[PDB]
Symmetry: D2
Subunit: 494 residues, 4 copies
């Protein structure tokens, strides 16, 4: 069931959100927000800079003070607020999915059925953790009573990318709020709008003022202000590995703020000769092509055993030739645009290297349309490891298919990258599934599937694909700070 919005969407929220009120920028500047499918300006939004991030941090700090409503409320009540926010996002599902589709260049069916469903489910999952974050009592040596408090860390700076704006917003704020933190969020310059609507719902839900502050604007200004701030306790960032390195460096230089990073990948799939071939083709296909290839987990190197390689390439190419490009809001359209010019250019430039460096172009490999940042869905076979398209994250609808005959060697090739976000293994063999997934240097390893994400699992990168994990039980640890309290007593008993 794919319902739709009956009136044309109006944009309402375009201001900086601090202490549950709407602020003009300190400078008074505003910046335009575009639709990637039409190249048309949707609206303008208040440009947050260092001066605005400073207001936002001061409000977050005040909301975190000992004795404040947010610090003193029952953990169960933090949970209640989060489940209420999920109910409000569910109420505004049509509006939010439409705004998400229009601003993000994101197919509406997927926006409504997947992105919004995941947002609501992740929030409800995090709500449930709030009053289940626990420390320990510890049988220390000597006559002492020792316990630990898993406290909130404090003011968390949270920088969100443009590829899944709502999902990424909730992946940040859900766990941070569940644990009792206050946040300063910087949504992507390309996609501020859905986050500003969520801010209106945070107010409506009744979160105390200053617990969530949202400062739209650019990365090199508002994002740098966050990463270098002397009174932000933690920065969480999802985006490029390049910017990830700047974030971690700036945290080091400033106040040694805690860092988690969810970065890019060059994620490999290994398809064994005994694999269910159609299943492997279908998952590897969606694994690389989902949301116009703009996923950090993009299955951008597919190694297939030689005896099934030709059949794999043939079936993959036929699947890639089935797309219908267009405005992501029109029903039946199955591929929207890339987010912007910068990305569009990078994608086309990398497509040209595949041709020049000698990969076999099976289909696509150029642009589409008179308007909008559209790239034809592209497949390269006979890709080799030193090619640019095998080493660099494309972040576009461009599939690479490689051959292998040695399992020892293809695991080395899979692991021979600075990335390590995820990987896929396709086989019917129990031993192969376990041993290969153990040997892959990847944060998530899918077996006979790909791109299966859920709130109950931790998610994050090995190596330069990330630091730390988001979601699951394990992800909640990185939004707590552990305090040991050791009390002298006359005599302990076990």
């Amino acid at each position: 069931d794919l319902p739709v919005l009956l009136t044309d969407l109006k944009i309402q929220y375009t201001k900086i959100f601090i202490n549950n009120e709407w602020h003009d920028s300190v400078s008074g500047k505003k910046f335009p927000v575009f639709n990637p499918a039409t190249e048309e300006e949707l609206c303008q939004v208040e440009e947050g800079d260092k001066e605005d991030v400073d207001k936002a941090v001061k409000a977050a700090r005040q909301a975190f003070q000992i004795g404040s409503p947010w610090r003193t409320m029952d953990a169960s009540e933090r949970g209640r607020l989060l489940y209420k926010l999920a109910d409000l996002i569910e109420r505004d599902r049509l509006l939010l999915a439409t705004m998400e589709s229009m601003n993000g260049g994101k197919l509406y069916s997927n926006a409504y059925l997947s992105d919004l469903a995941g947002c609501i489910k992740t929030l409800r999952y995090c709500a449930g953790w709030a009053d289940k974050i626990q420390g320990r009592t510890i049988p220390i040596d000597g006559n002492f009573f020792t316990y630990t408090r898993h406290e909130p860390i404090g003011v968390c700076g949270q920088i969100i990318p443009w590829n899944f704006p709502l999902v990424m917003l909730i992946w940040k704020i859900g766990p941070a709020l569940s644990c009792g933190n206050t946040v300063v969020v910087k949504p992507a310059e390309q996609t501020p709008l859905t986050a500003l609507h969520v801010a209106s719902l945070i107010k409506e839900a009744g979160f105390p003022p200053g617990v969530v502050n949202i400062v739209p604007g650019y990365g090199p200004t508002a994002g740098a202000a966050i990463s270098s701030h002397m009174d932000i306790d933690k920065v969480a960032f999802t985006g490029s590995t390049e910017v990830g390195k700047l974030i971690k460096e700036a945290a080091g230089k400033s106040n040694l703020k805690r860092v988690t990073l969810e970065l890019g990948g060059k994620s490999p799939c290994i398809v064994l000769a005994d694999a269910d071939l159609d299943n492997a083709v279908e998952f590897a296909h969606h694994g690389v092509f989902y949301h116009q290839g703009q996923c950090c987990i993009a299955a951008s190197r597919i190694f297939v055993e030689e005896s099934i390689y030709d059949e794999f390439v043939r079936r993959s190419v036929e699947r890639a030739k089935k797309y219908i490009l267009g405005n992501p809001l029109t029903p039946g359209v199955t591929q929207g645009p890339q987010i912007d010019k910068e990305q569009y250019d990078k994608i086309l430039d990398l497509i040209e290297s595949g041709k020049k460096e000698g990969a076999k172009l099976e289909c696509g490999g150029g642009p589409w349309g008179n308007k909008g940042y559209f790239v034809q869905p592209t497949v390269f076979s006979n890709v080799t490891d030193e090619m640019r398209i095998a080493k660099e994250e494309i972040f576009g609808p461009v599939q690479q298919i490689m051959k292998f005959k040695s399992l020892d060697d293809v695991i080395k090739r899979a692991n021979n990258t600075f990335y390590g976000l995820s990987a896929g293994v396709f086989t019917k063999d129990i031993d192969k599934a376990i041993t290969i997934s153990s040997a892959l240097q990847a944060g998530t390893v899918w077996v006979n599937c790909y791109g299966v994400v859920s709130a109950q699992c931790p998610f994050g990168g090995f190596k330069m694909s990330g630091n730390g994990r988001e979601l699951g039980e394990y992800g909640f640890h990185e939004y707590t700070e552990v305090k040991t309290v050791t009390v002298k007593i006359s005599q302990k008993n076990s």
Copy 2:
């Protein structure tokens, strides 16, 4: 019972330890090691530089490869090796404590009774965790079987300070080895010797080659090589907050390696009017004066309620006047030297600011002896918050005593620092003990005691006193990397 070594100690191990064999430096240079009590050269040690760290990382990487003895052995057997290492350290307790005392300027009674006891106990504690590191099975949405592996991270670079060389060595290698990591250790330039003896015991215990590699040398060369290395997966560092910032920055610039930091402090004690006064004086005293003040947790700001302040200062001063300075090896001696000239100078310079900025000198405040980096035990009363001695870590035998009358205000003053390693609260009031310890922004809060450390507790800093925790159950998480494995199935059942 304080037994002693019957023969004069000979130094045997002075070389770089890689793949369980002793190496000369690549350059061929060596550097001198001194006794801080006599200023005399004890020996020379091979100077590890970038070229040597490179050999050490290659060996650690090879020992970590899938299919290696260290990766394939039973977790229970990693545990067994660690308990064997503890038995060997216990066997060599006299030798190790003597070498630790002589090289570190550390009182021998404390070296033997505390440092070595803590080393052995921490190793035995970590051994027990080895086969109890577990992932999860997770009821993900959809028809999937999801589990997680809490894998070792990989090659861990571990930089150790000079103040507790053996304890800090074991705090690093115990958890890292228990979890299945391989390590490259850089002991302090001042104190390489006890670590090199432990390396001989790692060989004797039967650890596979390359699992522990020890590279002595300087910080700006060997330490920088570690922090900037493109194939070290994690750096752990204990030391100054200043160097901590360089470590985190370099990790960011290079390969986004995981970082934990245990840094300095300016740790406060709050002594309420209802406190057991003698107990508060005794613990605050040892809290600041332990190991010539060379503890990151040094209780270097003692806030005392006004009505008991005079009596507190009087009793504290009398306790500080009871010390006997000398060579840390002579029985009855109760205060050894500072580690080196750099520290000695910093301590005296800060003592001079206390005088100049207007603190009341109660006792001490100059050097002692014709040889050795000795500082008289010093007490300042009427210290105020803007003084250098109230803001900067002294790392010397220098106590600061402050007065307060308002509990709200003294908690602000306690928290008004970029540090946050630890704190002390002294009171008989149940409510005060709980509420004050909750409000303090400190990693460990002691109630009616100070400096109670044990292997079962997590330990680390809030704010610029650290990132992450060492020891306890919680500390073991930062030596694992979490992998989610998600397997497609026909139908799941709860």
Copy 3:
């Protein structure tokens, strides 16, 4: 804010609830349900017997089969159903509290403000656990992959008492359903009605049929059928220790079904001379007198240090003389009736022993009113340990106050009972609070309070006050059955 129902309550649901449909009894018999305040018949309800429990178990077994909707739905969806049930109970709060008050003899202010609030909050807490129940991956010796599944146990028989009918219903079904079990509930013969309304809401919420089955009737028939059934996997019971022993015996005789028991108590309070006296009097008062003394945790032995004993008794007696007896539905009424004749008789008989055995009657000690099972609120001082009123659970509004001078001896006296549900300690001394609470053989120990219950804490008895725990993280374990899966592999890696 105490709102009320605008129309007089009508009873609608009076039938046995199996497979989400309403059933007449197999025999066709019905049994009367009374109001304890008027002694008047409210209605008749279908009498479940062994033959009906058999239908209910068959439905629960079918709902638990591998491949069923309840076994195959997402854990997150079990959670969703539970949060929906909580929303429906919140919607029907006025109706449920009124029915609870009228059928249970329970003061309406408390029914509405506490019982219903606790029901809703406990359900919401349990909902949050559903998709957070996890097994482990385990580094077993040898070349194996080992994981565990924390499965639901299966069909759980759940026997509920009359004193907190709704709260006890939700304490049973919340965790059992969160974990994926199916249930056969036997509410108390005195109080079937609110549970049958909840059954209508379980249907409305959309729980699959057979997941919850409710069989009203008597204990020696329907309760015995449950405890002795060959295809019930687990029995959970709250009630008398006497019946608890019959339940455990019958489980042993039949099919070794798993057992948890929440039984009675003779819970002690220790009031030290340094205690906040008014706080200790107020909490000890409500600790014994709550819900006409019909709490398993009733603070039915209050030991007070001699120097404050007289003042404690005086203040307690004045507090007990402030009650207004009457129909629990009338505003301003502060004490309702006992549940029934059996209990009423037992209470009066025990009150007579206090007089005869030589306790000092301070106030009360007889019945009240022309109708309804009312007992005057009673206080005995100078109670000694061999008295019946100091050994036996009264379950009525009858307080016992004792004196002590030796802390060693009063802890022995506190622990000198076969019971062990809970206890209270009142002191300002940190050491006393910790050491006394450690030494008490009680499941919950309150310090400077009493009767503080919350969903986040485990709750249950030491000794003959119970087996196992309900609620908290820990309580959820007893609604899972652990399966270890060990898979042969060619080679494991850490």
Copy 4:
């Protein structure tokens, strides 16, 4: 490497062990201990009865008192004592294995290489848990500080079977002691001797007196005394399901003591057509024939798919015909005797039913030798579900092989038993391995193996095969009793 004892074994310890001293029985009676291979009397042992169990419980109770050495020692020191006991068992490995072989009828190679290795490893595993048993700090509603203590339960009565006397002794005492309990152990009447030697080593290791008490004797006297004792807090029993029911009943009747049971089985294997046939034959073979079939996990129903059934039966029969019967002490001997006459008779009687009820006798099916309780290794093919040999636990060297063609139906047949200790699944199919192991109602499910037991895994039965789990992290919970401590505070902060 199978070394042996150089002198003939002498029996030294034959007395009741209470408070670390050797006691004659209260009656003064003694009972004979036999070698099952020769039918010859080895010695006499003091017969413990109710009067002796009473002495043992009083000593255990005193060792558990608040303030005792066992309650006040560091958890790390409980661990140390356990690792010391493991070292002493390792020292006496030859003596213990020989005594175990001679008294238990247990093949010496297995006694030395498996039983003693498992004893030592399990103890070392449990030692590591001692100072890692932790409670929680819990964010309860309202202004309270809540924590939990995972205390030892108290005096644990532990009844051990004859089939693995040392392993079962350590499986009981290891976790119970690690958690801080005191124990009264009743080893099997057939096999008291190795436990009494371990008692001498508990004394030598330096356990405080009364922490471990061992009372040899019979089950219907000493075992009943334990199960019905009013001051034993918990009973743990491994043995027959029949006696298991008596234990649970008696706990119910007496003092509602906590119960865990590890009972018998009729454990099934499902061998799919795609299985590695030789691996399935080898593991199913050892799965049923290990230790003369005297394992609770005996793979006593092997369901094989029809197309490989004939080949499976043929290969299995050839493997069963390779045994060499004799005294378990002679090298090359590969099958020892049954434990005693009672078991021997039961085995032969059940073998006769297989013949009479129409199973196909492939080999064996009678006794062997002039002396010793020897049974020929027996294989029945064409077994059907209503046969006695398919329903009843034989506990002898008797294999049952069945055919199936429907996977749905063979899972029903596998699950169609009151037992549920363990099961085996043999297949190369990933989906089959996961789905079948999920659907089996068995505590341990092995995939492509059988009888893989390790200290790191929990172990126990579904249904009438047991209550609770032993070993792993999960097993340690059943040796703790949880206390919630809830402290009133002025104001909480997260």
